[PDB]
Amino acid sequence: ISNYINTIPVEEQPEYPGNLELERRIRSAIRWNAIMTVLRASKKDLELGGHMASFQSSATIYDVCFNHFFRARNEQDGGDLVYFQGHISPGVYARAFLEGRLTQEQLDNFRQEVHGNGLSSYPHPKLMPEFWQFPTVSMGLGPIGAIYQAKFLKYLEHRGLKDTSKQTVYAFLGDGEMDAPESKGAITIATREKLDNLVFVINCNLQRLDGPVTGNGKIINELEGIFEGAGWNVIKVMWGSRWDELLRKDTSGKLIQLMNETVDGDYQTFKSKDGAYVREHFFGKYPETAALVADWTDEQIWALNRGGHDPKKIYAAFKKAQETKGKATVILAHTIKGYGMGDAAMDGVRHIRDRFNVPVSDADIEKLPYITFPEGSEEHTYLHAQRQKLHGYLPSRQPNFTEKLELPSLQDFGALLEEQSKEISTTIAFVRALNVMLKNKSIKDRLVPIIADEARTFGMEGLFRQIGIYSPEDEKGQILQEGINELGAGCSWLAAATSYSTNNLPMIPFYIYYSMFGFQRIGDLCWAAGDQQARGFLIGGTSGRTTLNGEGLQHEDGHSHIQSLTIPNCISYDPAYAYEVAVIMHDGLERMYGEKQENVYYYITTLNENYHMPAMPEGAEEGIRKGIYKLETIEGSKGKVQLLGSGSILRHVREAAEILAKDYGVGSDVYSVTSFTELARDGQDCERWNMLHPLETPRVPYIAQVMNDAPAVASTDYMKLFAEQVRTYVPADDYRVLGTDGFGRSDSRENLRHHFEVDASYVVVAALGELAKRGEIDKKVVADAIAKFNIDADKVNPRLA
Amino acid sequence: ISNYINTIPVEEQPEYPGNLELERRIRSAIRWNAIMTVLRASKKDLELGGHMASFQSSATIYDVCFNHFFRARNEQDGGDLVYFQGHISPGVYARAFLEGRLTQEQLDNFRQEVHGNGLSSYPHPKLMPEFWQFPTVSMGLGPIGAIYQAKFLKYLEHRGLKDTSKQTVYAFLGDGEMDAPESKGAITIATREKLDNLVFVINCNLQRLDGPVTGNGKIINELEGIFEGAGWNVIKVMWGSRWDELLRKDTSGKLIQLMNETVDGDYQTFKSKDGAYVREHFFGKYPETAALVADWTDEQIWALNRGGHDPKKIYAAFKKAQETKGKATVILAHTIKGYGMGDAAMDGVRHIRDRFNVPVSDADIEKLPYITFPEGSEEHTYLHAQRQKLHGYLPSRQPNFTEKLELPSLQDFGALLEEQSKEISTTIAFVRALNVMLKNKSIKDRLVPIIADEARTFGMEGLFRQIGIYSPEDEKGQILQEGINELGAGCSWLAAATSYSTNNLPMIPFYIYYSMFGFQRIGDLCWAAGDQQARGFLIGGTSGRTTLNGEGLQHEDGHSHIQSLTIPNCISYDPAYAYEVAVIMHDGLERMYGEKQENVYYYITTLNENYHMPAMPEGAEEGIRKGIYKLETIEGSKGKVQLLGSGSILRHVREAAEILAKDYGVGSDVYSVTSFTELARDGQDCERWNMLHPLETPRVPYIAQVMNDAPAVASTDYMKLFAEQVRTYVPADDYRVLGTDGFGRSDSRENLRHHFEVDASYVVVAALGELAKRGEIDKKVVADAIAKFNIDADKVNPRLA
Ligand SMILES: Cc1ncc(C[n+]2csc(CCOP(=O)(O)OP(=O)(O)O)c2C)c(N)n1
Numbered sequence A, B: 001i002s003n004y005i006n007t008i009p010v011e012e013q014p015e016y017p018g019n020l021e022l023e024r025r026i027r028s029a030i031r032w033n034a035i036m037t038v039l040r041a042s043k044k045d046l047e048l049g050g051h052m053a054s055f056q057s058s059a060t061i062y063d064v065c066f067n068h069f070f071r072a073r074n075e076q077d078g079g080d081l082v083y084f085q086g087h088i089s090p091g092v093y094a095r096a097f098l099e100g101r102l103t104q105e106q107l108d109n110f111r112q113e114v115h116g117n118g119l120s121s122y123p124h125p126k127l128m129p130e131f132w133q134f135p136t137v138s139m140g141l142g143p144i145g146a147i148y149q150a151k152f153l154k155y156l157e158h159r160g161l162k163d164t165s166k167q168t169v170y171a172f173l174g175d176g177e178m179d180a181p182e183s184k185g186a187i188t189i190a191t192r193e194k195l196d197n198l199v200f201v202i203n204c205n206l207q208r209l210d211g212p213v214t215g216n217g218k219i220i221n222e223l224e225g226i227f228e229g230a231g232w233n234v235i236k237v238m239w240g241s242r243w244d245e246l247l248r249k250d251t252s253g254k255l256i257q258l259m260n261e262t263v264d265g266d267y268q269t270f271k272s273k274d275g276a277y278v279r280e281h282f283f284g285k286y287p288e289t290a291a292l293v294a295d296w297t298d299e300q301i302w303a304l305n306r307g308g309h310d311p312k313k314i315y316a317a318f319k320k321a322q323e324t325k326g327k328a329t330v331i332l333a334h335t336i337k338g339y340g341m342g343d344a345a346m347d348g349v350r351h352i353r354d355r356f357n358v359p360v361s362d363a364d365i366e367k368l369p370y371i372t373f374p375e376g377s378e379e380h381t382y383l384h385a386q387r388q389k390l391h392g393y394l395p396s397r398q399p400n401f402t403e404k405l406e407l408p409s410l411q412d413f414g415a416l417l418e419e420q421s422k423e424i425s426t427t428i429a430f431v432r433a434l435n436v437m438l439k440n441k442s443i444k445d446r447l448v449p450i451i452a453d454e455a456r457t458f459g460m461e462g463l464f465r466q467i468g469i470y471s472p473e474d475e476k477g478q479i480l481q482e483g484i485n486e487l488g489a490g491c492s493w494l495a496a497a498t499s500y501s502t503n504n505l506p507m508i509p510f511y512i513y514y515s516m517f518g519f520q521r522i523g524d525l526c527w528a529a530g531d532q533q534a535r536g537f538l539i540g541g542t543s544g545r546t547t548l549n550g551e552g553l554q555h556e557d558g559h560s561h562i563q564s565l566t567i568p569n570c571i572s573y574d575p576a577y578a579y580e581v582a583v584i585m586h587d588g589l590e591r592m593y594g595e596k597q598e599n600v601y602y603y604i605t606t607l608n609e610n611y612h613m614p615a616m617p618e619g620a621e622e623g624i625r626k627g628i629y630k631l632e633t634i635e636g637s638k639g640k641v642q643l644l645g646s647g648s649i650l651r652h653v654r655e656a657a658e659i660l661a662k663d664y665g666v667g668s669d670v671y672s673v674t675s676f677t678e679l680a681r682d683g684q685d686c687e688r689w690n691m692l693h694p695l696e697t698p699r700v701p702y703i704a705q706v707m708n709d710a711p712a713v714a715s716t717d718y719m720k721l722f723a724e725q726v727r728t729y730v731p732a733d734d735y736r737v738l739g740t741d742g743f744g745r746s747d748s749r750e751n752l753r754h755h756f757e758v759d760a761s762y763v764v765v766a767a768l769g770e771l772a773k774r775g776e777i778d779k780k781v782v783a784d785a786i787a788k789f790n791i792d793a794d795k796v797n798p799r800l801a
């Protein structure tokens, strides 16, 4: 760790290129409007909330960036990708308002978006599709998301897809936010990948939200130590310009010593006291130091400010970051929380107006007016000119990509639609579907297969030879191998899945991993992905509680679909056959990257178990997309039931269909449910519509148009709720669901399917049970099936096992 | 970083205290049995899986620890807490077998546990409650979990609850696992908390599972740099004893230069070659280095080994770590993946038999026999003598704590069962409940309130001045403030929630945080918590999609309950009133820390919205615990409906009941649903049981015992599925569900509830519509109600909004 002073000594500090006075007048208007927006919202007394202190402490850091660094989207590239600290949004809206991009009506509707003309609390592309770009309010996601966005930009360049060399990724973070594991856990990656297009800006105001990050230590020293240890270029912006003379005079190096020994707690103390108290406890600690401020007046000593509030120190840091190559840069900016707010952190409103020389008269101050700069005014001219030289205004977002892709047709997946000679898995089918896409000249280079170390398990090695692994195995490799880092891989997927908007370059990512380590491990990222309008495919491999049989409790996934259904724009499927996979992937491509350009992403679970793959029934396409289609109708004179199955369990449901007809004369309609979730959502939409249109004829849920009223049984490799989801819509009086509720454990597939009570024998017993309650068969035939199938009717409920 | 050589020179190396020859014989037997176990499982051809290469590389490291360092649980403390690397479990099972703690039948049931006499693939306490202690297979969780476990041990000593000064926490990690953000994301905490009771042992065999961690880099230097930068004491065990002479006579310093410059990829290539190759490509890089081994035979050069395979080098490292204070230590052990297995890594396996001088006939190898040491033999005597000196065997685990706690009675929370004076929230109710617990002499000091920075947002301020904040606000402080670090806070919660087992010292953690950043963000930890049998409370504050109205899309939680219902042993509640919070907390406390010692943890969502808190209706306690109870019935001669509500939406449902009665003459039964999930689970357990016992009296779902058959409407602040999950069990033909499906957005609570179609207006229309379909009233009345309430029958479905 170096001394507690600026990394860039004044001797190496470049001259500041801007008009300080004018930029400050503009900055003051932004500070004012940001505050008025929050205060006006507050007046409504609707508990809307909003922050002020945060933006106040970092306004100058952002101001320097908007005036001299941030490149807006242009014809060449998407510009600088800025991960704004979420809590400073009022500051971003304030500036956008001044730039005339937001109206006063919109600002007056800060945090009131239901009626269509408001502003989101934080950066949410989903809510403001033409304004915000990156969701950052979930502490920790911004930094790791930024690292991988930066790596993805390199990837796009290395693969000759787009020249992104002029794009810089900025991640603005708080020192408290650095406590999140995701904030520092992936920094060595920036070093390995030599991400010189990534800049971390850490606002070290030493004040989290409920106290300091570390009062007994020095958070800046901790951050420097670990970032330096990680190979990053660390730039500390500790003190303002007023300290430089003192540092030069300091010949005994006693001042440096004083600053080094002084701890955070001490520094936060002086912050509240006065100039006398400072030159007493601080400067008044050594004859050499106390002598430094002898000619200084208590007024001049109290003027000493921190580097994060000095445009000149800030510019030097960003400039150096911009020039650095070979490694990522982190700027530790020392600021004051609640800067210039005195009171907090009309008397208070008057204080800041005077503190920042805001152009608002006493006559208008009561009205909390917004300040504007008329066209022709010096401020208006400078504001727009600085931005014009930087290609425009940011943030901004284009909701749709412009080019038109020539997507492969379903026919191109022809081989997958016919019976398979060999027994394969849906995972192998997925890989084969990828190969089809890899043969489409229009999208072949747009595909981004992503893996987290394990590739052999997913039979992806076959692609390694075809398209290679991205490894700046060379920089032309198409596959992203992120190793044991699902969060990093997910961030790579997100960068690729939103490339269509960010760089107007549609990339189609396919992230394959252990389904268990998907939404469960990176769910916060999947939620952010929906907010970011990601369009891609998440492939949950080795899914199903009973299918990844030998791995046990922390690997067997019987609930990822329950987690995925919580995401509004995530479309989920659990296909049993190779042709369903083909149809679903095709529909997904067409919907997301076809003319429709729907803002959804696909979650498809695939299996590691091989079995016979039949041919797709004629006309089953639409049913497969909708989520359900009748596979076949097995005849039977002693009764009729409906059997629904999905994923690896469908095969067993069909076995049960045979047993029911062969041994009990019970016929049935067997349906393959490719997506219980899509069916449930369709049902919900129908009932909602019916409720709001009482004078109209009721709409019928699709599942209800496909099924009849005969007793039904459903079984899947996921917890029961996955299939119980559609209960309200099933037009039968009886609907029994089997599922894999409970912790997984190690064993053979057969033992697990029996243990979780989802195999053929249980489907049969469940079906006979429903028929028995209808009087179609004697309850005793049910009790005998139980004995016959060696079913332990008294074993503990698997959910409790 | 330092030179690519051992941190501890021979001169400073303590004499090895054990019998090297004897230990070698014992270790060879363990290596052998570990391999026999996995191979025997392979023979069954049931896709059980299992690894061998990993343990082979770290076997000697664990051997030195088992022989000279690992202290087993004893009368004074829980002994050393070892986070074993997940996939090396066959080696731990093999040692347990040799120690006589496991039988051959168990080894033969490796990864076949459904029938009760098998072994889990990985460390899963839930599955082997008396053997394993810490789930580590989910890469990344072990490191951070271990850090917070060590911090918790010091917490227990500082608080004067237990002297843990003789306990050391060991975390064995692989170098590839260090890529998970969680692995290094929290290592600076070990320095902040001066965790000299923590030792990280990183097995640096230089490769993941699909290849090297960093082929073109040096992972060991990368780790040294970041851990040292983090303030940790780093000890590198690079080379075996045979290198000492070479390094001693190398007066040119060239050998060191050679070691420093060679990258991981090259080192890995040497292993797959031979002596001549190494003499040429390694030592042959320089005249000086070539001369050092010039008089050496190719066989002697090939004998040079990595430090992690030399007991003397390993011993020295662990001994040094034991004497280091004021900071944590990380040992970087250089090893060979697939050590002694030949080739890459029936009869071909006779290679390992020869390599490790395994005492097994070259004729019996076909049977894959396990080796054992008969009592009275040098090996047996030594094996046990070393462990006895270290208090016994590990791992081992006590499923229940021994002491008896005198928990508070429901009456002690009496104040919370009465009508509250002013309007408060369920979060304020939660805090008041905590204060009641803090007056209980038996558990007051065992309580561990945990907060993720934000504490004043949850009204925790009052508790600070009362019990203080842990800050070794002093060492006696009781509250754990972990800052913006949900995962860290969750790991502290986990350490506390499992203290009853590891230290036989029950502690009762209450971790309150923003519900949106609960399961969605630390879901994998919550799953591991279930596996680890955690007993504590997770309090999801500021919950409900429409209740945290200003925050928007990434804060408005309308689905944490959907995610929590996926964890088998997590009991979830969403109470609307203060008395419900009191009843739930009391019950949870009694179930987990009372005589029952139920292995479950609680998840309770609380609100930030104040409203009238009525008195608990007499006799509602059990219904509150079960998930539902009837609040009241309202008379009406024109019709009758059932209205269900939970959390903050319940009061709006009651508003609807009044409207229906006064404006339309429609009466109703109003129910408060404290837990739709427990009701759903109960329902599922009932029908599961009924399905399996077709001849017996069917069990009736609890919800069916509370509700009748009149058309029903349910509304909650969560997505429809939260309430729809009980459809199957609801005894009414009509069950309409209103929910907050779709991404949240900022606005007033009033506007969000209308937008999400969950306010009183929608409940009324839903109810009137159900009656219109039954011909109870003219459809026009429903049409007119829609108009009167300003309902936009055609606005887009909120899920798509
Ligand atoms: C994952 C997550 N945890 C917690 C929060 C709540 N939160 C928002 S800001 C904040 C503290 C702000 O401190 P810092 O990150 O240092 O930034 P500052 O506002 O001081 O610049 C917290 C805990 C959140 N939004 N997301």
Ligand SMILES: Cc1ncc(C[n+]2csc(CCOP(=O)(O)OP(=O)(O)O)c2C)c(N)n1
Residues within 6 Å of the ligand: A452, A453, A454, A484, A485, A486, A517, B054, B057, B087, B137, B138, B139, B140, B173, B174, B175, B176, B177, B178, B203, B205, B207, B208, B209, B337
């Ligand atoms: C979160 C998570 N992702 C992936 C895996 C799959 N996995 C099991 S072992 C392994 C590689 C382990 O490599 P390393 O940590 O270097 O240890 P080694 O076996 O070489 O000692 C992986 C990726 C897992 N268990 N958990």
Ligand SMILES: [Mg+2]
Residues within 6 Å of the ligand: A174, A175, A176, A203, A204, A205, A206, A207, A208, A209
């Ligand atoms: Mg801060």
Ligand SMILES: [Mg+2]
Residues within 6 Å of the ligand: B174, B175, B176, B203, B204, B205, B206, B207, B208
């Ligand atoms: Mg390794």
